[PDB]
């Protein structure tokens, strides 16, 4: 959408977006609920606006010949 | 093992450990001129230029009857020269009206409605005819954050799926918000092709669909592994090769015309009454 | 990738370092499988993708 | 194994365009044959330079010229039939077959291999 | 005159004529151009 120079297909595998930790990080549940409320409150949809938004992507011959033709003819009527 | 839209609620009540398969919220609801100038300004330059020759010509009913007969040119003396330059640029007219037919005959081969038409409280065009589950999850969100729209959509109650069903295939109703997945189903599901809202690919929430277990027992690590291994076997494309299988998978260019036509009509008039003038002068 | 030395399948990068303890968080697009969920911690994934 | 099977309102607002602009330029004329200034217009409507004559007045060869009204309207119609006219299931798949109806009937021949 | 009229008086109902027919000449010129089109197909 940005470089104008195209996909092709179908999403031909279902992937997601993860994140990285270490492990016994408890504070996930309340993260996994600011992820729902980010997607309930439409954070989500202001980040969608902001970023997604941004989608982007003879004749010369004929004279000379005429030119010709004119003297001919004219050389043919002062003739005949 | 029931599907359910991951809310904070249910993530609050029970446990959710999966991969969950991804959905979201949304409502069932039921030119030819860059041609002409291209060529145009070629061939009056060329116009231009075969009058000036053509006048030329008969260095020896002239000054009018020139472009006249240039313009019947397309439209379908005695200088035999003259005769063969209608000859070769009558030949030009051919050809250039042949490959602007043939250009013509080239010609002859609603996602932000949430906001001004449902969220936009007391005026549509025809009045608010909504659809609900009274249960689910989707009555729920928009209760919590689009109350206006909550109580514009609980005036009309749907006993189903089925009910809203045959009342958007009637046209007895215009909206019902359902689940989006399940609508996605029912894009593989109907045959007439009155079928399925706007198909942008953007889905009006983001939850997912999976199973439910029990907080903190011993408890299905390897059901997790096993259901990513799956889904990176590739055994999801299976299970909707399976079942999701689909079925369904003027008057403005007269009326552009017709105001080009009253322009040269006022211009024409402007020219008339410059005409009348110009005796007075 | 598997180490060439005595039987090793290690992680490199952003999950060799987290692997390793470098790293509190790790915020990348990251497709995890299962040989990244089988040794972390993670919250919910949330864009969905093909 | 295969399966057998069985084998209008663009004329009169024209023709009022055609008799407008016949009174009106020939009232205009006469200011400063109107049965023939209405056949001379729809002849030349009908993609034909009619009779011999020429308007005296050069303005009204002029609107002649620009009403190339015809041409446009013969691009019309062959855009029409280039549109209306001639511009526009097997067993292995679904559409009809693998999810059928009972309006797509089956049969085979009863005490056979099939 | 007839074949002319395929090929682009004082009696006004004889125009009449050539108008009409001319009209004939021109819908069977555009069916036929269609006609070899389908052909050309």
């Given at each position: 959408s940005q470089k104008c120079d195209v996909t092709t297909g179908e999403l031909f595998f279902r992937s997601g977006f993860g994140i990285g930790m270490r492990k016994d990080s408890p504070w996930k549940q309340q993260v996994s609920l600011s992820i729902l409320k980010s997607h309930e409150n439409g954070f989500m949809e202001d980040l969608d606006k902001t970023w997604v938004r941004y989608q982007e992507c003879l004749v010369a011959g004929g004279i000379v010949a005429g030119i010709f033709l004119i003297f001919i003819e004219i050389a043919y009527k002062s003739r005949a | 093992v029931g599907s359910l839209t991951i809310n904070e609620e249910r993530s609050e009540v029970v446990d959710f450990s999966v991969p969950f398969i991804e959905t979201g919220i949304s409502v069932m609801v039921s030119f030819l001129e860059p041609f002409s100038a291209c060529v145009w300004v070629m061939m009056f330059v060329m116009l231009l230029i075969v009058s000036a020759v053509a006048v030329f010509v008969f260095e020896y009913v002239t000054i009018g009857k020139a472009i006249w007969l240039l313009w019947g040119l397309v439209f379908?003396?005695?200088g035999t020269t003259s005769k063969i330059m209608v000859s070769v640029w009558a030949f030009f007219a051919v050809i250039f009206l042949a490959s602007y037919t043939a250009n013509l005959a080239a010609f002859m081969?609603?996602?932000?409605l949430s906001d001004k038409?449902?969220?936009?409280?007391?005026?549509?065009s025809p009045p608010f005819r909504f659809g609900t589950v009274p249960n689910g999850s989707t009555e729920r969100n928009i209760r919590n954050n689009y109350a206006e729209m909550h109580a514009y959509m609980g005036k009309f109650n749907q006993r189903g799926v089925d009910d809203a069903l045959l009342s958007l295939k009637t046209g007895k109703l215009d909206a019902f918000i359902y689940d989006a997945a399940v609508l996605n189903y029912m894009a593989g599901?109907?045959?007439?092709?009155?079928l399925v809202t706007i198909?942008?690919?953007?889905?009006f929430a983001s939850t997912g669909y999976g199973i439910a277990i029990q907080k903190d027992?011993?408890?299905k690590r390897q059901v997790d592994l096993a259901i990513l291994q799956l889904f990176g076997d590739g055994e999801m494309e299976e299970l909707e090769a399976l079942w999701l299988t689909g079925i369904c998978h003027d008057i403005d260019n007269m009326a552009g015309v017709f105001y080009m036509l009253g322009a040269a009509m006022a211009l024409s008039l402007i020219t008339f009454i410059s005409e009348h003038l110009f005796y007075w002068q | 990738e598997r180490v060439q030395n005595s039987n090793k399948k290690e992680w490199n990068g952003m999950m060799g370092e987290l692997l390793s303890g470098q790293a509190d968080m790790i915020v990348a697009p990251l497709t995890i499988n299962n040989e990244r969920a089988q040794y972390i911690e993670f919250s919910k994934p949330f864009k969905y993708q093909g | 194994l295969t399966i057998l099977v069985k084998k209008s309102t663009l004329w009169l607002l024209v023709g009022l365009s055609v008799h407008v602009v016949a009174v009106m330029l020939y009232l205009l004329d006469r200011f400063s044959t109107l049965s023939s200034a209405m056949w001379f217009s729809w002849g030349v409507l009908l993609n034909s330079g009619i009779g011999e004559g020429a308007p005296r007045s050069f303005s009204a060869r002029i609107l002649g010229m620009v009403w190339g009204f015809a041409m446009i309207i013969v691009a019309s119609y062959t855009a029409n039939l280039a549109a209306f006219l001639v511009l526009d299931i097997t067993g292995?798949?679904?559409?009809?077959?693998?999810?059928?109806?009972?309006?797509?009937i089956y049969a085979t021949v009863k005490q056979s291999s099939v």
């Open positions: - | 379908n003396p005695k081969i609603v996602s932000g038409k449902f969220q936009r409280p007391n005026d549509f599901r109907d045959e007439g092709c009155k198909g942008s690919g953007k889905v027992s011993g408890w | - | 292995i798949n679904d559409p009809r077959l693998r999810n059928p109806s009972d309006k797509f």
